[PDB]
Symmetry: D2
Subunit: 380 residues, 4 copies
């Protein structure tokens, strides 16, 4: 029996790698993906072999991540419950996509991951796994094992000889998520010095910085005049935005599994792109088209959040969003200053921003008022 494990290289997925061998007595193919977490994946790969993997694979997926997941999602203007830019949500589908690919390649009947039974990630990994390969089997150790505590796990790690040691965090090219630990108290401000991707505003440059982003057909293609690949462009904007401490949000969100959760996120580049896109949309999108698109954005967002990426509903909405986004061509000029991003200008080759006279407006008004007057009259 072979099991392809989504291995990140930490203590848990290492314990899980051992656990899978003892519990199933199968070969465990470890897979580590580079999506910008800031770790050297080749290390995790070698640690995977050391830990017992029969085969470890490491792939650089930054470009695929931004090009085929982050960008399509951004075109839709996806935002979960007012503030979440879905940094972790869009990454999972990519990983799962590879786990199943590798499994079909290695002749592995199952895949495994270390997401807990209480979170959203388990749903994301599995819904995409089953959607891509219905016959695939999934193993989620967190839902199957007996450990009754952190302590038991560390011990178990030593029993097997695995290197060992306030909040949990997930980091990739789009953002860094922080939650759990002291963050569980919604009334408690995140601890000083917690953020890693964005410099702290109180320490950000005293002078504003200006940045311009060019969009071609729904996707950002250049920064300050320099053409950049999708992954390179996201990186560039994280640097510029991070320096100014841009893209910080603190929210209590609704998980798909049923309960609320306190989350803190930093999305510098993505936050710049969010506003840059709308700034350009303000000149290139028709009024009614925009209004309809914005009322659908929330649904698309919850789809992505729940894990329905490789689902027909999301791909259907995607057809609408891409169609609208095809017109988003132009440039946004933004001003960054201590945690804040201010749009200060925008231009577009086909801006709709430049017919009728005074009388016309009066007729428009009369026709629009008709039903309200009949209403009042009837209420007589």
């Amino acid at each position: 029996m072979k099991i392809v494990l989504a291995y990140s290289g930490g203590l848990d997925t290492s314990i899980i790698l051992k656990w899978l061998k003892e519990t199933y007595r199968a070969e465990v193919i470890a897979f580590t993906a580079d999506i910008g977490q800031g770790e050297e994946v080749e290390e995790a790969r070698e640690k995977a072999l050391r830990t017992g993997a029969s085969k470890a694979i490491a792939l650089d997926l930054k470009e695929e991540f931004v090009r085929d997941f982050v960008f399509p999602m951004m075109r839709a203007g996806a935002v979960y419950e007012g503030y979440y830019l879905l940094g972790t949500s869009i990454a999972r589908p990519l990983i799962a996509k590879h786990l199943v690919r590798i499994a079909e390649e290695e002749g592995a009947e199952a895949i495994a991951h270390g997401a807990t039974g209480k979170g959203n990630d388990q749903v994301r990994f599995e819904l995409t796994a089953y959607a891509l390969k219905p016959d695939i089997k999934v193993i989620a150790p967190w839902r199957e094992w007996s450990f009754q505590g952190r302590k038991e796990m560390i011990a178990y790690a030593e029993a097997h000889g695995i290197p060992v040691p306030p909040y949990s965090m997930d980091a990739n090219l789009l953002h860094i998520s922080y939650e759990g630990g002291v963050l569980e108290d919604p009334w408690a401000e995140p601890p000083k010095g917690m953020f890693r991707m964005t410099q702290d505003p109180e320490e950000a440059p005293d002078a504003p910085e200006y940045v311009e982003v060019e969009f071609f057909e729904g996707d950002p293609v250049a920064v300050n005049g320099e053409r950049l690949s999708p992954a390179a462009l996201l990186q560039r904007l994280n640097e510029i935005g991070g320096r100014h401490g841009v893209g910080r949000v603190d929210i209590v969100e609704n998980r798909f599994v049923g309960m609320k959760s306190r989350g803190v996120y930093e999305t510098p580049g993505g936050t710049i792109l969010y506003h840059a896109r709308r700034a350009v949309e303000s000149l290139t999108l028709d009024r009614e088209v925009l209004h309809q698109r914005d009322m659908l954005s929330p649904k698309y967002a919850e789809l992505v959040y729940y894990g329905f990426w490789y689902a027909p509903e999301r791909e259907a909405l995607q057809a609408y969003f891409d169609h609208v986004a095809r017109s988003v061509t132009g440039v946004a000029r933004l001003k960054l200053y201590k945690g804040n991003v201010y749009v200060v200008g925008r231009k577009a080759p086909k801006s709709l921003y430049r017919g009728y006279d005074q009388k016309d407006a009066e007729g428009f008004i009369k026709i629009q008022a008709l039903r309200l007057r009949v209403r009042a009259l009837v209420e007589r």
Copy 2:
């Protein structure tokens, strides 16, 4: 004949007052409403009697404004095209309401306003008027007079003897709007020194300032532990937020009367209220209720923007929003720092934030995955 004129005490409404007497040779009742424009409305009222007003009326409407218009709208989470908090939009209905009432009290056959024939305001004034009194006669001088240019208009004023004097402004308790003139070029950053209600971010306190807002069944009832009437509360928050440069928006919006327009808005208190409300909602609203409310907010927003306040569709949606808002009770703790508003804490007496067995998750996932698996299998 009698004509009730929404008189703001400015050049144009003064010109309009003379134009009304000279043209219709009717009795002109001037009406100035104090909605927080920061003008000694009493001056306006005297200046009107001194401009030919057969009777001038001034009313302090700050409380009614915030209580009967701003709060119901905030309760719904109204945001036009992603950034506009509708500062000017919700104020017009209030004015037209009184215009019509006064007209009925003074036995006047018609009312008048000085909104131009190219804007949204004329629609807001007139839809309100027609909805409240279908038989009302409306006179919009900007659509009826021959004046071309202001050089001309200045002449006419100087003529009848009427005091005479970069962008246009509209101010009230909720915000200050800037548009036109130097603002018409979408690529041009607004001019240094334009903002009046907010302190320039760069000139804002070097130390962050925390503020708490208490909501009771949808509405803000206190700040930093001090109970404050609707108007006093918005005022208090404008002061606190203004000093930090909070609530600045720069957008190119879609007008109802035809095309696009570049607008700049500062809504310090409202911006704080927007984030505070959502912070309290994150603990008191059900997931599915929230996702539905947010998908309807945009529609409510354009209704307000277009001028459909006293309209059946808006009042119907209001029933949905008021129902949901009734549960929003708690306190939000926010951190203000150089133009930004950060939520750092929230609490609620009836918080839904805390029967959970992880294996249940797997069953949840399998059922959710079914339709996806069938789909893939059929794709064979």
Copy 3:
């Protein structure tokens, strides 16, 4: 230990009654509700005692059913996937509501039902049970026992002295549902003679029959001038509509558990009410209100279909629908002929059916066209 069992009197629930006694060594309190199934509930209540219940309860819940469940649902214009009037769906919450109440009165820690683990009803029963009493225990034998087929179940029943008597059925005052067996092949027309509540259209009266239905504030209060209570009103319309073969539907629907199912439904009275309601709405509801309402109806229908009746989302939407329905006052006149229902007339005290001239229309047109013209000019 006591268990409140939803006992319908058939073979399965009788077998379930025995099963629960032995399996849980619990005292079983049977509950049978009269919701218009057309059976003598008292005979079910007696059989329960014969079968072993420590107590048997039987209540006439037809009035509460139509008044507190069917009527509120109809006000919403609820239709699942274009045709399903939700006859079985809105009935389930009412049964469960009583199980929990009785359980509360008898000091029972659990409730049980005979819905299978493959369909929608189990979800409905339990979601309402959990929502009304969060700590109640539920027992669904179909998900807990291991019978390997009817054969074995008959034997089990015979063993306990439980009398043992092409498709499945569910009937109540709203409709009769048929599915399973012969009906599983979606390409096969239902067998002749299957329908019970409605006359075969080919056998309906050669003369059409006119009927008038009066609505007061969103609810039907009279038929042909005779004031009738909710339950009696549905009954009357079932008679009149049934005699003409009205209300027959044949569809393949999407289940909440994840698959597709072929269902046939007859809803004579409800189908007449559906068209009668819209007929009265056509004179009493505002255009924009109606359009917003119809776009929310489907969401509401799926909530009902899924089982989220006692859920905050459904209650919220209800506030909107009720607000709108309050204007539906008037009379609908329909013509019934061989399977079809034809609206033939309508009237209302506050009808909005019968303030501008031709010139006004041109202005309306010019303004609505502006954005379209700009778009075309930019396309050049």
Copy 4:
């Protein structure tokens, strides 16, 4: 000056042809389109010449009408206010599209139509005209001339040699609309013998007729195994459906010009297609996709009704609808009987109508119920 007139051949457009020549001192190019009104278009073309047209064009647009307007609309499941299949609405854009093309080829600066200044058609003609050719000049005689009565118009007609001859009618391949006159009283049943496209159910065959409709990729491509072009197919279904009196609707609709009107429509073929489509969709569309699609259909319907065909909103939604519709491939089997259309069967090559055990179902319920249980416990 050259004016391209939408010439129907009747009295008013003949009067208009003369009116235009003398009023604008221009030559008139008459355009008559055959869209299935059951008229001899060449007779209208020749009558135009006799009336003074400098050139008369007559085109058979039946295939284009159904292929490029009706089908796209049906693919979206478009239905206005519950019953209107938009028979007249989708035909208007097609007419105007040709008026603009002819004006362009003929060097005409303007186009003219005979729609009155108080209806919906004027908006449809002009919105598409301006959208396709922004600088085109539109002349609508009804909003411009001074005729003050029918009598004066007849005298004018006779003066110019134009031959002169209960409700009004509009007929094309999709339907026949009836409104005005005796039909203006919403409480009055339409007069006997009014219908023309459909036989009265009272006179329809005693034997029901089965009909099969094959859908390829969202569009109907065959009837009873016979491959038919769009127009030939709609025609065929009108014959079959008409013989059975199928597709009659009687509604009071909300006009775009702000008021209500009583309309009676017979859409035999379109009605069969409506149900046929949903029958095939019941096996080919995913649950979530269908639900989203049905919530957007009404919006698309109002767009078509108001006249926003060649508009960005409609084309953006169309991208969504066409995406979904692409999966609609299969055959629908319906039973026609005295006014009714019954779906009795459906099949599809990629039917999603054929993965979990009861245990899975329990986990699903538990998770789905969590938030509801938390809500209940909090309410205490």
